[PDB]
Design a protein around this ligand. Structure first.
Ligand SMILES: CCCCCCCC/C=C\CCCCCCCC(=O)OC[C@H](COP(=O)(O)OCC[N+](C)(C)C)OC(=O)CCCCCCC/C=C\CCCCCCCC
Ligand SMILES: CCCCCCCC/C=C\CCCCCCCC(=O)OC[C@H](COP(=O)(O)OCC[N+](C)(C)C)OC(=O)CCCCCCC/C=C\CCCCCCCC
Ligand SMILES: CCCCCCCC/C=C\CCCCCCCC(=O)OC[C@H](COP(=O)(O)OCC[N+](C)(C)C)OC(=O)CCCCCCC/C=C\CCCCCCCC
Ligand SMILES: CCCCCCCC/C=C\CCCCCCCC(=O)OC[C@H](COP(=O)(O)OCC[N+](C)(C)C)OC(=O)CCCCCCC/C=C\CCCCCCCC
Ligand SMILES: CCCCCCCC/C=C\CCCCCCCC(=O)OC[C@H](COP(=O)(O)OCC[N+](C)(C)C)OC(=O)CCCCCCC/C=C\CCCCCCCC
Ligand SMILES: CC(C)CCC[C@@H](C)[C@@H]1CC[C@H]2[C@@H]3CC=C4C[C@@H](O)CC[C@]4(C)[C@@H]3CC[C@@]21C
Ligand SMILES: CC(C)CCC[C@@H](C)[C@@H]1CC[C@H]2[C@@H]3CC=C4C[C@@H](O)CC[C@]4(C)[C@@H]3CC[C@@]21C
Ligand SMILES: N#Cc1ccccc1-c1cc(-c2ccccn2)cn(-c2ccccc2)c1=O
Ligand SMILES: N#Cc1ccccc1-c1cc(-c2ccccn2)cn(-c2ccccc2)c1=O
Ligand SMILES: O=c1[nH]c2cc(C(F)(F)F)c(N3CCOCC3)cc2n(CP(=O)(O)O)c1=O
Ligand SMILES: O=c1[nH]c2cc(C(F)(F)F)c(N3CCOCC3)cc2n(CP(=O)(O)O)c1=O
Lengths: 400, 118, 134, 177, 26, 48
């Protein structure tokens, strides 16, 4: 574009070809600079621009179908079921051994409608049964309150998430690393800036391991894309609006500009062409031609286009359990009346013993082995987040 | 201000950023600009001032003096700058009251109708 | 009717030229009217029915009108109160102003008239079922 | 600022004080225009600007009648109503087609209602197929009521205003503002 | 939340005792 | 609102400070209506 070498004092660009007589006009994105208008003329700016921020278009999270289980860990949901069995089984045992309406068929039913806080009809009339029901009544009071409170904590923290809308937002929030091309007007903007925000941003960028500076614009656009939220690229306003309209439609331009530049049309400082060109640009500005051409090349040739309430995507598996719960209940009324329309202890003899034989065995073969706990471990790199394991491990109750 | 969020005023962006920093803090600037213009320092046509003035404006722009003066007069001398949860009022939950009385109104009808027409 | 703010005793009794709180309580107006209409028709049926107990049928459909009066008196108060709070929201929020609504004894007598005409309706279903008994 | 009369062709303002000789320089918010730089000399712009939109700041909205429904989307409330009919029909088909009766179509609506508003029972379905209709809708209710309370708590904690319009493309499409 | 599990099993443990004791000593 | 006594080493600290925090604090205090500056220490303790 044009820069006077400090040694040889020689311009080397389109500014060079105007100073050294090779050309008559430079109609190009040439920034109106002090050191350039000392050697050439400029028209009034045909395009105003500045330094802007490029971030990735944020993301949305996809609720994997059983996402409604997420406020409690899967170890909790497992031990809720093991405690649902345990409270049902202890009900039926206490109820048989009492002066009954209860079966284990009913004791599965007391313990569920107490988990769902939906009331029950069968009351454990024994005061030994009242200890069973009462502790499962308090159990599910603490489990339901913990589900609602951890889900409220999720939805509050997700609503407190504020995207970057300024350079002050990048200034404060240091979780996103922001950078610049390693050689140009954008890097030299922050290096000499005596504005408090941009002085702080330069302090971050010069002192950052690994390097936030990229070497090419196409390198800096790529680093925005393969960082998923963590890189912001400081570039010029017009390339930011142009890459926003490319494929993939992945990045976006946030904020206003951080400074004010202009692009001018340059003539060789003596020309008879310089004055009619200056009045051409002001005529094309006020006849809307310069905004018409920007729409044509940024937006009309664009490869892209141009609620706070909870959605069914989130609570979707609670309907799939509901349909699957109705679908299984059509099966039962089928087979149970087919048991009734066709309507002993040796099967009770066989099953109770043969369950124990595996039952003694399955705990036995598990406690003697060493595959209770897998344990991966290691360090990551930002190299596609690819992981090496520097500690694989197994565990048993004693045999590790 | 006196239209309850039903009048949007199209004006220049530098006044729009200035009125936003006044008292009250009622107004707000939205979007980006619609056209692009500039304010320049004017001299008579053919004048000794013209070329040193033009090189002065470019030097103040790149040293950051013109950005420093705008933060000063628009924002540092700006009146606007830059909680404590309140009780739920009845206007927020007035719907379940209308569904309650509307549920009692549709319940007295089904009582008075069907017991007569048993 | 105003007071100490410019001290004027200008009971505007608004029908024409003028704040918007006074226009929103205009919107809630028909519900204490219909409630007062169903109180009056519940009693001018009640007063004649002390003279004529002769079939049984009187104090039931007056007791319907005692209960239907209070239910439209609820909707009267809910629309009245919510219309205040809608306009207390939209005023302006400075740290140098203070708005203070307060409900008076005229509001309270309307709310006391709820419990009386509802409990009147409860006894009105009582002695209807005593004359249907006798 | 300076304009030219159609008849007298005389420049007013700060422009005419430069065209005619009263002044030597005009440091001002003076717009670089075509018709003005034909008669004076501007510098490069010291301030860039344009036409913008001014709106009143968004405050807390007014609550409608059905404002209490807003923690869940309308797509959910419909699918709850469809599922409430759905679990009462299936509870009826459990009861009518070969039961264990007392659970009519009007009773199966009444069991699933107090189930979803979490209000006891009247009688347990006493089948097994009635229980699975009863038991799964009880877990459905628990997740939906907990998601209502948890999403309303997020709303009441974090006040988050939005503007109606965000550009001049938006103003052109609407007719409300 | 491991406490309400220990109170659950500890509540079932103290409930089987009161069952096995008192029905024998009726 | 935070303030300083109107004449002393504390006010002249912020006035000449070129540290980014204290430069911002001086910008607030010089441009503040009503005046955050007190005239006496016992006045400034009372205003707290
Ligand atoms: C007889 C044994 C039953 C065990 C039930 C435990 C529930 C969870 C199972 C845990 C096993 C540990 C295995 C470790 C891997 C986790 C698997 C899991 O977490 O399993 C959930 C399954 C679907 O597996 P997923 O990995 O794709 O989902 C998780 C979503 N991801 C993929 C993003 C993480 O979800 C499902 O549908 C299946 C379970 C549906 C929800 C059950 C919780 C309680 C339900 C009703 C209450 C009980 C009545 C009253 C008391
Ligand atoms: C006293 C005792 C009472 C106790 C009562 C409780 C027991 C009641 C029974 C409960 C179980 C019901 C069924 C739940 C089992 C799993 C449901 C399921 O897995 O259903 C999801 C399906 C498939 O979705 P996906 O997982 O393959 O998604 C892609 C997965 N990804 C993203 C990982 C690649 O979705 C669909 O269309 C299926 C929708 C229609 C199926 C019917
Ligand atoms: C079994 C059900 C048991 C009891 C329910 C009985 C009926 C419920 C009581 C009547 C409700 C009613 O009468 O509500 C009248 C509303 C008022 O209109 P609005 O402009 O203030 O709406 C506010 C939205 N905002 C301000 C943003 C424009 O009008 C509307 O329902 C607009 C029509 C929307 C469709 C709803 C159908 C009727 C309403 C409830 C059922
Ligand atoms: C038995 C008697 C009724 C129970 C007590 C409620 C008071 C009755 C209202 C009334 O008549 O005297 C109270 C005031 C008259 O003094 P003030 O207007 O200068 O209030 C200035 C506030 N102070 C009084 C602090 C200076 O009136 C008011 O403010 C009304 C505000 C308080 C009343 C709440 C509105 C209706 C509530 C319940 C009515 C239905 C249930 C029946 C019981
Ligand atoms: C009617 C109720 C029905 C059923 C409940 C029956 C009993 C409950 C089950 C026994 C609980 C138990 O067995 O808990 C043993 C604990 C373990 O001690 P820790 O040092 O890990 O405490 C943890 C605190 N940390 C880590 C900060 C030092 O010991 C202790 O209860 C320390 C003694 C504190 C006084 C509690 C009395 C006994 C416990 C529950 C009743
Ligand atoms: C049997 C019942 C449901 C009859 C219906 C009348 C009442 C209950 C209804 C329920 C919802 C209410 C509405 C709610 C508020 C709106 C906006 C307000 O600016 C004027 C009244 C208006 C337009 C409605 C009028 C009255 C209305 C109070
Ligand atoms: C009938 C029941 C209650 C008998 C009690 C035995 C079990 C259930 C109890 C309940 C609370 C538990 C405790 C909980 C965990 C602590 C700390 C841990 O570092 C060692 C075990 C220790 C100190 C306890 C031992 C075992 C203990 C598991
Ligand atoms: N949102 C939501 C939601 C609604 C109902 C039930 C569960 C959730 C939910 C909860 C959680 C969660 C996680 C940790 C702690 C607490 N809650 C997460 N998610 C969720 C949302 C999007 C993608 C994946 C999970 C969820 O969808
Ligand atoms: N506030 C409130 C409130 C009180 C009870 C029930 C519901 C609400 C409510 C909830 C929500 C909402 C929205 C999204 C996510 C979660 N909650 C919104 N609103 C509301 C408030 C003002 C105007 C319109 C709706 C509400 O009024
Ligand atoms: O007059 C100048 N005009 C410039 C115009 C542009 C572009 F945006 F493409 F129009 C760019 N790029 C910015 C990033 O993407 C690739 C090139 C550089 C310019 N530079 C050099 P810099 O500003 O020193 O980096 C000038 O000197
Ligand atoms: O050169 C010009 N410069 C201008 C500069 C400004 C200001 F913003 F104050 F700097 C304004 N205002 C816009 C908002 O209301 C107050 C006055 C008008 C200007 N006008 C006249 P307009 O643009 O035709 O209306 C010019 O001609």
């Amino acid at each position: 574009y044009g820069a006077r070498d400090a040694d040889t004092k020689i311009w080397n660009g389109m500014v060079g070809e105007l100073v050294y007589g090779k050309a008559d006009i430079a109609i190009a994105p040439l920034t109106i600079t002090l050191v350039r208008e000392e050697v050439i003329d400029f028209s009034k700016p045909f395009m105003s621009l500045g330094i802007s921020i490029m971030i990735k278009k944020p993301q949305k999270s996809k609720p994997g179908v059983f996402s409604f289980l997420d406020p409690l860990a899967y170890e909790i949901w497992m031990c809720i079921v093991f405690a649902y069995i345990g409270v049902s089984v202890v009900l039926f045992l206490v109820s048989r051994f009492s002066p009954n309406e209860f079966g284990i068929f009913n004791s599965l039913w007391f313990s569920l409608g107490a988990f769902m806080q939906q009331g029950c009809d069968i009351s454990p009339r024994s005061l030994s049964g009242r200890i069973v029901g009462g502790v499962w009544w308090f159990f599910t009071l603490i489990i339901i309150s913990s589900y609602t409170a951890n889900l409220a904590a999720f939805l509050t923290v997700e609503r407190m998430v504020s995207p970057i809308e300024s350079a002050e937002d990048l200034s404060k929030q240091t979780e996103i690393a922001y950078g610049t091309l390693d050689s140009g007007s954008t890097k030299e903007f922050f290096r000499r800036s005596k504005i408090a925000v941009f002085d702080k941003m330069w302090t971050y960028m010069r002192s950052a391991e690994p390097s936030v500076f990229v070497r090419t614009t196409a390198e800096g656009v790529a680093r925005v894309r393969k960082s998923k939220g963590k890189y912001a690229y400081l570039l010029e306003s017009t390339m930011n609006e142009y890459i926003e309209q490319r494929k993939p439609c992945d990045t976006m331009k946030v904020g206003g500009n951080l400074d004010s530049k202009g692009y001018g049309i340059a003539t060789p400082k003596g020309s008879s062409l310089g004055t009619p060109v200056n009045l051409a640009v002001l005529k094309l500005s006020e006849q809307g031609v310069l905004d018409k051409l920007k729409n044509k090349w940024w937006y009309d040739k664009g490869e892209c286009g141009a609620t706070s309430a909870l959605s069914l995507s989130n609570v979707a598996g609670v309907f799939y359990i509901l349909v699957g719960g109705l679908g299984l209940a059509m099966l039962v009324a089928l087979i149970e009346f087919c048991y009734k329309s066709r309507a002993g202890r040796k099967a009770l003899t066989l099953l109770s013993s043969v369950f124990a034989v595996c039952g003694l065995g399955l705990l036995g073969i598990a406690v003697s082995t060493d595959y209770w706990l897998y344990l991966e471990e290691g360090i990551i790199l930002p190299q596609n987040q690819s992981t090496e394991v520097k500690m694989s491990l197994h565990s048993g109750l004693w045999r590790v | 201000r006196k239209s309850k969020g039903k009048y949007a005023y199209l004006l220049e962006s530098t006044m729009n950023e200035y009125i936003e920093q006044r008292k009250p803090c009622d107004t707000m600037k939205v979007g980006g600009n619609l056209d692009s213009k500039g304010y320049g320092i004017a001299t008579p046509k053919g004048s000794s001032l013209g070329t040193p003035v033009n090189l002065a404006v470019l030097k103040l722009s790149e040293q950051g003096v013109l950005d420093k003066l705008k933060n000063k007069w628009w924002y540092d001398k700006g009146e606007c700058g830059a909680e404590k949860t309140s009780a739920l009022s009845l206007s927020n939950v007035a719907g379940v009251f209308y569904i309650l009385v509307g549920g009692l109104g549709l319940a007295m009808l089904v009582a008075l109708i069907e017991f007569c027409y048993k | 009717c105003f007071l100490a703010g410019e001290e004027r005793g200008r009971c505007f009794t608004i029908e024409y030229v003028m704040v918007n709180v006074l226009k929103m309580i205009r919107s809630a107006t028909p519900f204490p009217l219909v409630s007062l209409f169903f109180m009056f028709i519940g009693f001018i049926l009640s007063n004649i029915g002390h003279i004529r107990p002769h079939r049984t049928i009187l104090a039931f459909v007056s007791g319907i009108f005692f209960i239907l009066s209070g239910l439209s008196l609820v909707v009267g108060l809910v629309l009245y109160i919510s219309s205040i709070n809608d306009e207390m929201l939209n005023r302006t929020k400075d740290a140098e102003t203070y708005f203070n609504y307060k409900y008076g004894w005229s509001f309270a007598f309307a709310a006391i008239s709820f419990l009386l005409t509802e409990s009147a309706g409860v006894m009105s279903v009582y002695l209807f079922m005593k004359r249907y008994t006798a | 600022y300076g304009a030219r009369d159609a008849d007298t062709k005389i420049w007013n303002g700060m422009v005419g004080e430069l065209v005619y000789g009263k002044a030597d320089i005009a440091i001002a918010p003076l717009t670089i225009t075509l018709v003005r730089e034909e008669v004076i000399d501007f510098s490069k712009p010291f301030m860039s600007l344009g036409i913008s939109i001014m709106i009143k700041k968004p405050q807390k909205s007014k609550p409608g009648v059905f404002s209490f429904l807003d923690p869940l989307a309308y797509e959910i409330w419909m699918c709850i109503v469809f599922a409430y009919i759905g679990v009462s029909v299936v509870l009826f088909l459990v009861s009518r087609f070969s039961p264990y009766n007392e659970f009519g179509i009007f009773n199966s609506l009444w069991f699933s209602l107090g189930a979803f508003m979490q209000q006891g029972c009247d009688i347990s379905p006493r089948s097994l197929s009635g229980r699975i209709v009863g038991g799964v809708w009880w877990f459905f209710t628990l997740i939906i009521i907990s998601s209502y309370t948890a999403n309303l708590a997020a709303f009441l904690t974090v006040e988050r205003m939005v503007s109606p319009i965000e550009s001049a493309e938006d103003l052109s499409k609407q007719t409300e503002i």
